[PDB]
Homo-oligomer: A and B are copies of this chain.
Amino acid sequence: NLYFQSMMAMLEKIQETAAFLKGKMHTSPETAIILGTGLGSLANEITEKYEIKYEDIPNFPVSTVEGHSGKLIFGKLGNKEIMAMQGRFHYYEGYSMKEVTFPVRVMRELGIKTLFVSNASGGTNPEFEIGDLMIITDHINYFPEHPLRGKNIPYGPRFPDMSEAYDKELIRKADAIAAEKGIKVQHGIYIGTQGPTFETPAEYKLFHILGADAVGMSTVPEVIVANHCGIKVFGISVVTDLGVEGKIVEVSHEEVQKAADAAQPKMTTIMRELINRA
């Protein structure tokens, strides 16, 4: 009853938004990139660009966080057509997990087959340094709300297997690219937590104990939903501050944005080659 009508209404919104976007587009991208905090300038590398602001898209959330421009960018990255979310949505803004991940449902209907996720994070692995790029090999969902709770959208499984949520072959390829380009990359586990407070030292320590290498407030829900949708996932987390015991200092979102912006060109090189060698 109520759970069903909720799902029906969501399917209607997905179709209305997807129809709206097809009516605006003149390319057929098969890869999408979600650009997190400070990482929006990847879009300066997109050619033949055109843009649709989130505020103009029916049913779309809007980005309220500083450093999230709030537009969809279409164009070529290297020689392949892509679409990029220049800015994303977070559960701490007040959005439900179904609103946070609504764009991934719409990307499925637009023909996206691969999703690249990026974010700024705090490093809990003591080997990490600010500015490191961490290829995400697995994640921990530490949010209190799961985007798939409720009636199942029937094109994916009621109970998705998550043994390989991040495509192993894309990671192997990204490693090869990074080695050829001489770009240092880390690898590890991202934990997603609601925020919006940065962690206490005890909370950073907790996340280290649980096996996380980097912590942030995004990404996990979009990966879950991409997995449900059958969309392949690659993810890079940019370490923008340290949550390492003995090394914690005051952090600010302003400094996070500057650190992410400084690392963006190396991240974009890897993603551009990953798209273009496939």
Contacts and interface: CB of A to CB of B under 8 A. Distances in A.
A162 B209 contact: no
Contact of A162 (B161, B200, B206, B211): B200
Interface in A222-238: 224, 227
Contacts of A189: 202
Nearest to A209: B210
Contact of A146 (B140, B149, B194, B251): B194
B149 A91 contact: yes
A162 B92 contact: no
Interface in A188-232: 189, 194-203, 205-206, 209-212, 224, 227
Given A163-B248, A211-B206, A252-B159, A197 B140 contact: no
A155 interface: no
Contacts of A160: 196-198
A86 to B, nearest CB: 19
A161 B210 CA distance: 22
Contacts of A149: 91-94, 194, 196
A158 B94 contact: no
B202 A140 contact: yes
Decide if the interface of chain A is mainly helix, strand, loop or mixed: loop
B196 A140 contact: no
B250 A163 contact: yes
Interface in A255-277: none
A132 to B, nearest CB: 19
Interface in A127-176: 138-141, 144-146, 148-152, 157-165
A254 to B, nearest CB: 10
22 contacts: A3-B94, A92-B146, A92-B148, A94-B151, A139-B200, A139-B202, A140-B200, A141-B200, A146-B195, A149-B194, A157-B252, A157-B253, A159-B195, A159-B252, A159-B253, A160-B196, A162-B199, A163-B250, A197-B227, A202-B211, A205-B211, A210-B210
